[model samples]
Target: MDLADRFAELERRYDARLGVYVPATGTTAAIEYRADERFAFCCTFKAPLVAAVLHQNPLTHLDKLITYTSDDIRSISPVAQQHVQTGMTIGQLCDAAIRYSDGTAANLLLADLGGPGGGTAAFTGYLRSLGDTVSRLDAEEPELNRDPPGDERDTTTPHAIALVLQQLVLGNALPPDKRALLTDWMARNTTGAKRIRAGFPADWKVIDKTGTGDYGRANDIAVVWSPTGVPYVVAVMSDRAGGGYDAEPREALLAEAATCVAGVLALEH
Candidate 1:
């Protein structure tokens, strides 16, 4: 079997469905599998959420300190827990959301744009502005992770999200400074070390955002620079329906999928 077939076999063995996308550049071809299928985006929404915040308030928002209490806390908030009363700048909140996938920090930032439904409106609007109508943000973290099948809420296809990521990371979507800050935060992401990054060569640089959801969903979207300095945007979103699934294996499968893509790309030193 070819690399794509091997990747599909891994998905079957893992009992998960994967939607993968690697965009075609001038010299490199694209790699795709179930690329148009919708999957719960989970915390991956925070990436564009931050981009929207910057798009609307590019100059005046980063330094503004936002205060929060323990009431704002949510599950999986490592960074927000440290600054319960100390307050955090909008920039720091963005860093926490992207780099640490901190739910509390994401909510705080979401509230700044307007809470839940309103935040979704603002975020979806931003995506539309970028010519992406398929990606939708209908809820905040934890709630968005519900990921019920056939439900489109908070869902995005692998190709859709990757296109948005390409615009923000490589194309001229935001002001150069704002784009740089978002890319810097993604480069510092700490939650994906064992997922896509695990499949990459040691010298390669990866900037990514990860999402974990209900029903064995584990996803990562990344822009990787090979040792030869060529950049590739890769997005993988996966989920399983049955019971008895755990995070470790879900992540391992994602890593395996990445390895397949790396083999096809043939990145060199």
Candidate 2:
């Protein structure tokens, strides 16, 4: 089968959809993807929320120290305990938000970015600036994805997510240092080590974010940089598995599929 056809077949078998964009190759398409479905974005929301924070704060927030107590902790976060009642620079919190997918750190950063629903407002404005489509990103993670009480509509699509990653690399938004910081945070993300990055070559490096929601949704947006310096972006999301969000099936699917797609990107580069 041709590449596109193979991707279509994979989606049928795996239910893990894909959207890729490589500007250098003039490639931008939502392939073998569920165009209509939206998956809860999980911590991946922190990436752009980080962007909007910088935009609104004008890169000055990096040095600001925000103290978060035990009461601030919420949802799934790996490193909240270490930070309870302690203070860390906003930049450090941003790292925890992306690298560890720490919910408390992210919401704390968001709270600083904007009071109440400021992160939501900032994300809306940022996406608009990039001309990307919308996704539901209401409150914080514990209450972020749903419609406040519960629309369960807070979500993202592969294409729109991919475009944001593409714009991020293009560096049109934040200042150079903040952009570099954002990219570093994304590169440090090890949350979905098996999803798309599992398909990567050992020498390849990935800058990405992962999201897991109820009902078997496993999602990631990955920017893969080859040893030879070829870089490309792929965003993929999983449908609810039979039992629920088991990582194995979708991770395996994306590993093979995204790896194959990365080969195409390498050649184009």
Candidate 3:
């Protein structure tokens, strides 16, 4: 079947919304896709944070020790709950943040760096440093303090995120070594793999980030590399009016959408 026909068939079979962008050739495709629609980003925000930190600090020093405190442990994800209260160095915390999406570790890093202001300021500073205006970081709340009201946190579009990845890949925002480290961390992510990851073949190298919120929102951004050095950035975010936090249906929808996207890219190139 042709690409259009395959996509149409997949859309019908999946019955979910999607948005896809291929960076290598700037080719775009979408099924029930819209731009600028805000959805709560779960752990996906970590990508930018990782990039910002790597740009400011040396990876070797950052990775040297894992650090944490009692408060830090309390705010982390379930995966890192056991290790929260324990004393860790900086390196260990970064590993937890990226590898396990540990919220506690993220919060701790934010705190040590001077809170959300630090993250937001750092992100903004990096954008200015690069002369890229497409992305911006707004304030959430102080890490480990209390959750902000639903409406107070920051947001970003899939396109903006794609640009961020592009900058990272092209060595514009960060050095090659640091970018490579961030990419490696992303490739190791397993949190929401079943959805976007399912789109690729077993042997294809895929590096991506996935995030979901307690409010039933899901988001994923991936830099999929071909054997020929061509790379594509695929980002998808979804929400349901009545789904609330248990958006399993939305997640399933995203998985199907992602599969369709991958199939389209595979055939097009």
Can you write out model 2's per-residue Cα lDDT over 199-253, one digit (the tens) per residue? 7777888888887665455667888777977667777766434444343335666
Best-fitting candidate, scored by lDDT: 1
Ranking by lDDT: 1, 2, 3
Model 2 clashing residue pairs (backbone)? 147-151, 216-245
Best by TM-score: 1
Positional deviation of residue 248's Cα in model 1 after best superposition, in angstroms: 6.7
Better of 2 and 3 by TM-score: 2
TM-score, candidate 3, is 0.78
Residue 44, candidate 2: Cα error in Å is 1.6
Compute the lDDT for candidate 2.
0.69
Q: Which stretches of candidate 1 lie over 4 Å from their true place?
A: 115-117, 244-249, 267-269
**lDDT values for all models:** 0.86, 0.69, 0.60
Minimal lDDT window, size 10, model 1: 241-250
Our model 1 lands, by Cα RMSD against the true structure, at: 2.0
Task: Give TM per candidate.
Answer: 0.94, 0.83, 0.78
Task: For candidate 1, write residues 1-269 as lDDT tens digits.
Answer: 67678877988799888889999987777889989999888888889888888888856789999999998886789998999989999999999999999998888888888664587677788899999989888877668888576689889999999999999988899989999999999998999998889888888889899999887888999999888888889998988866533433389888988888887777443
Task: Encode model 3's per-residue lDDT on 97-204: one tens digit a residue.
Answer: 777777766665655454534756665566656654554555432231222224434555666666676777654677878888788788888676776777766556
Candidate 1 whole-model C-alpha lDDT, 0 to 1: 0.86
**Model 2 segments more than 4 A misplaced:** 8-24, 27-32, 145-152, 244-249, 267-269
